[model samples]
Target: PQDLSEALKEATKEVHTQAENAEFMRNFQKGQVTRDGFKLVMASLYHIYVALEEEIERNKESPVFAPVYFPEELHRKAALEQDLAFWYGPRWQEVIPYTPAMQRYVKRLHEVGRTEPELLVAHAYTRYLGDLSHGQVLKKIAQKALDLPSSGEGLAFFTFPNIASATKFKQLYESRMNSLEMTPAVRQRVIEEAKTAFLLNIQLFEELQELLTH
Candidate 1:
């Protein structure tokens, strides 16, 4: 058996590929999505980060969470707020609403927070790690694709000012995961939840792609 992060990566490889191959993702990578399409992606992600970070906050003190709960290091809601403001102005809340996919994703996060808080680790690992990994690449692609300002006005979500080294941070995060105390059954559940996390992401992308057609 491998370490927790290694096991998670291996188990979710296929699902992660499916997520990367999502129509919205494929088009975004190829620079085919319009500005509105790109903003739609940002809006969807805003809801996800909102839900995820809120749940993490609620469980931050749990033993399973405390080891990895670096709020300053992991939080994104504030950055997302800035991005939303840039995209939709000060009244961004009124302008941006959650799509059905985002609603479902939020509901899942809330559910896990309420009933299975430890599993939130699976979600944190899935999302935060991915953000740190692909965020810079996506930032450049989005800037070119949307003709965004060089000041990073609407792209605040991708900028990790405090995290100077995403590679080092990821290593620390994985080390914390390795230190978690879990039974075999719980470990298996966490891996399965990580796959489900990828599926939720793919679903959101598919739904966003459908929205773009309208």
Candidate 2:
């Protein structure tokens, strides 16, 4: 069996992590530049996240129709992000050059807010959802991972860095599940939250993509 459930779960997780990372990156940038510049960038980034979240929600209605792999269309969308590294080089300075989250969020709170306050606010919520999804186990998430454009690492934004084969990854995930102290019900609740986070992100992305063209 393709175990479509697993694929959907993985796909959902990937987008959620990306939304979270993007939000975090935005927070890192908040309030440094002009308000108008920040607004345009925030609008674009949030649009991307919401679109991804919405795509996941729409797929939930028919798990069977959920993509076996990352859809080619999405691959096209993702491929487009490479442009930011070029034309928008400065935008990525925080995330690409040196991720401050490892220090700032991992421990100390700091001053110097307002590089862009609205983005900081949006990112605050995005990071909250990111924290919510960490280390979750959803049965068969890899069924979809198999369909990812490349091995999971290629999609580092969401795919576990260590995961290569979706089947083996699923096995590893289940092995961890057996050791968890949480009840089955609680596990399910956490999975649902993760899904909700992904869905919201799709909505944000959709809005952003539209802005790029519209």
Candidate 3:
């Protein structure tokens, strides 16, 4: 394919379907409105984005990833911090939960970002794209379920102030992505890494669901 974006989408389509069928994945939104349930997800997201953005910065200048670096437009770390503060309170950093599952994801993010910088795009592809894919659905859901104020104080994680329209931003993002020049071999690995990222997400959902009963 002249452009890898379409290839990336088709390749991951099946693997993404696997997520649709997973029991917890199917119901990932079912229990999310409860304060504890909402906070659990927010906690993991904080840890995940912290690692992801750190890696993005580490690779920003490298030719392997420089083409697609758009920190201001796509970064979620600061947004997460604002939301986590609301849910965890002003002293959020000290008492926030960090689970073994989150540690595993963070470790894998650093692993790829540090060693195989090319594959770092796989995570960025999986994360920000997926985050944008969910777009405002989770935000509205959480808003109603948590019954938070209309002030948007606790839901900053879902807001992207820089992007006027996620649909248009994503189109531009893919155009930049299509510019990435990868040999077929590396491209395959990047595809593999994207799948790996999806599995990690499914696992995180599974773990979050388990936290419900215990």
Residue by residue across 1-214, what tens digits does model 1's lDDT show? Answer: 4699899989998997887788888988887878788778889889998889888889988987778888887788898889888888899999996888999989999998889887889999999998889898898888777877666588888887888789999999999998988889889999998988998889988998888897
CA RMSD per model (angstroms):
1.1, 16.3, 1.6
Error of 2 at 65 (Å): 31
Best by lDDT: 1
Error of 3 at 73 (Å): 0.4
TM-score of every candidate: 0.97, 0.31, 0.94
Stronger candidate by TM-score (2 vs 3) = 3
The segments of candidate 1 whose C-alpha lies over 4 angstroms from its true place after superposition are none
Candidates, ranked, TM-score: 1, 3, 2
- Please tell me which predicted candidate would have the highest TM-score against the true structure: 1
Local distance difference test, candidate 2: 0.34
lDDT of 2 at 13: 60
Q: Please, what are the lDDT tens digits per residue for candidate 2 over residues 1-214?
A: 1232343356466665565455423332332233223234433433343344334334423322132212321222333244334323446434432122222321211110122111121222233223223323211232233333332322222333334555564454333333334444544444554454455544543443344344
lDDT string for model 3 (1-214, tens) is 5477887888889989988776655654553347887788889999999999999899999877888899889889888889888888899999998887889999999999899999988889888888888858777777767778665587887878898899999998888788888898998898899889998988887787788657
lDDT of 2 at 207: 40
What TM-score should be assigned to candidate 1? 0.97
Q: Order the numbered candidates by lDDT, best leading.
A: 1, 3, 2
